[PDB]
Amino acid sequence: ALMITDECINCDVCEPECPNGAISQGDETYVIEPSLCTECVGHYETSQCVEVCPVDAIIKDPSHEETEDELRAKYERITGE
């Protein structure tokens, strides 16, 4: 999973880009819900929030380090099939 750091400028642009609805506005920055963040695996070749963030505030979350198989498994859980 990714996470949004303290560099977030609360610009809103990443929220509509997430295929899983993992991003929402928090207290002081936007926040990724890790159980919904597949790092876009299953939907896109790369993370869509990272592509749009203007200040590079979105990084790997080391407390939710996931393999590709885990991220694809999470995509399958979220979307069914």
User: Under the rule (CB under 6 A), what is the footprint of ligand SF4?
Assistant: 2, 4, 8-14, 17-18, 20, 22-23, 30, 32, 37-40, 47-49, 52-55, 57-58
Are 48 and 19 within 8 A, CB to CB? Answer: yes
Helices (H), 1-81: 48-52, 68-79
Has 8 been labeled as part of a binding site?
yes
| 10 Cβ contact partners less than 8 Å away, ≥ 6 residues apart | 25, 28, 29, 30
Has 6 been labeled as part of a binding site?
no
Has 16 been labeled as part of a binding site?
no
Indicate the residue among 12 and 76 with the shorter CB distance to ligand SF4: 12
Has 78 been labeled as part of a binding site?
no
- The strand ranges marked E within 2-75 are 2-4, 23-25, 30-32, 58-60
- As measured in angstroms, the least distance from the Cβ of 16 to ligand SF4 is 10
Which residues line the annotated binding site for [4Fe-4S] cluster? 8, 11, 14, 18, 37, 40, 49, 53
